[PDB]
Amino acid sequence: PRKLQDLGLKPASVDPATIKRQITNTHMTGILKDYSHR
């Protein structure tokens, strides 16, 4: 791909190296639901 760009030809590919991988009240044992955010 680098060589084609040097000659002015658009390369339809990329270098693979450029790809990046990507307490109280305990009598309510389970009644209390975690409404932490709204």
Binding site: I23, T24, N25, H27, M28, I31, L32, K33, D34, Y35, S36, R38
Partner: protein
């Protein structure tokens, strides 16, 4: 509230509490601390000592004293003198206290600038209306027999857990829960608070609970439909915002203190739905008949009457007998409660073991 209302960037704001003590290094900023941190004089650690030097060294311009009705105390008033500021503002809903030190606020922070009438704001839709009521709960004969003999110190505990008040509190809570009301139950006595919650199977909050747990309980009580009632204590008596709270019950509270009655009433004055037609917040104060609580109850609500709120006497709750079950209905259970409340008062050696 500061971040959302104004445009101050988070960079210039520093909070000086027991958790974090970092101070802003920018030219100017804000410090939202507590009187306990600034009023301490004897034991300040290295982390807090550096903050104290930063506060004292610089010449500040403004100081805001929320709940300024506790500034003229013995050592809370030291912060006013120690902290240098060219202007001082006091913000308290109630400007009264038991002792005659209330008038001292004139020279600690200045005179009274403006006072807003409670009734005028209520009719303008800015604050909710409250139907204050006082329920008379006559104590049963068996309990009252020990009331006369028992000493005053244990007398409080005796009539705070009278069976009649349990029935009133349970019936009122269930009736308002059916209506769909967020109920807050206040109780100064920790032991009574625990007894109510353990039997009723409802969450309770008191001084020993941590910040994380109480916040989790508070969040559940607000955003969850399953839980609609909580059992608070003197901790949440002031400067707590509960928009969803509409109903309040006070089984027993802090003797003759008046500000406690008014400040606790302020929790349900926060009702979000304070403009819908026909809405009336409910504020109850269960009081045992033929007890010193009547003397305290009539004395503590002497500030609300001055403001304009009127208390209604409820001798009996209609439909209370048809409720399926009530606490301590049979004599056997009542006597069991009476006895319980009456009874209240070398590496080598290591391998061997």
């Amino acid at each position: 509230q500061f971040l959302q209302w104004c445009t101050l960037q988070p960079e210039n704001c520093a909070v000086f509490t027991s958790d974090n003590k970092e101070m802003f290094q920018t030219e100017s900023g804000l410090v939202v601390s507590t009187y306990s941190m600034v009023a301490n004089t004897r034991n300040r650690s290295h982390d807090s000592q550096k903050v104290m030097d930063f506060l004292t060294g610089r010449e500040w311009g403004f100081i805001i004293l929320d709940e300024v009705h506790v500034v003229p105390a013995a050592m809370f008033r030291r912060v006013v003198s120690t902290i240098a500021a060219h202007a001082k503002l006091g913000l308290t809903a109630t400007l009264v206290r038991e002792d005659d030190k209330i008038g001292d606020l004139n020279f600690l922070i200045g005179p009274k600038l403006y006072e807003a009438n409670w009734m005028e704001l209520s009719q303008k839709g800015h604050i909710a209306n409250v139907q204050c009521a006082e329920v008379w709960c006559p104590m049963t004969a068996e309990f009252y027999q020990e009331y006369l003999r028992e000493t005053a110190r244990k007398r409080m505990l005796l009539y705070i857990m009278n069976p009649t008040k349990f029935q009133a509190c349970q019936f009122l809570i269930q009736y308002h829960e059916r209506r769909g009301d967020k109920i807050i139950v206040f109780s100064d006595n920790v032991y009574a608070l625990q007894e109510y919650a353990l039997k009723m199977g409802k969450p309770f909050i008191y001084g020993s609970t941590p910040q994380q747990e109480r916040m989790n309980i508070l969040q559940n009580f607000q955003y969850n439909d399953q839980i609609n009632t909580i059992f608070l204590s003197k901790v949440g008596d002031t400067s707590i915002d509960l928009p969803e709270a509409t109903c309040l019950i006070q089984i027993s509270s802090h003797y003759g203190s008046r500000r406690q009655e008014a400040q606790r009433l302020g929790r349900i004055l926060r009702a979000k739905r304070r403009n819908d037609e026909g809405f009336n917040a409910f504020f109850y104060s269960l009081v045992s008949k033929d007890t010193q609580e009547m003397y305290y109850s009539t004395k503590r609500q002497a500030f609300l009457v001055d403001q304009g709120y009127a208390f209604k006497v409820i001798t009996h709750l209609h439909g209370m007998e048809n409720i399926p079950n009530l606490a301590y209905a049979s004599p056997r259970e009542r006597r069991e409660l009476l006895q319980e409340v009456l009874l209240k008062n070398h590496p080598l050696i290591r391998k061997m073991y």
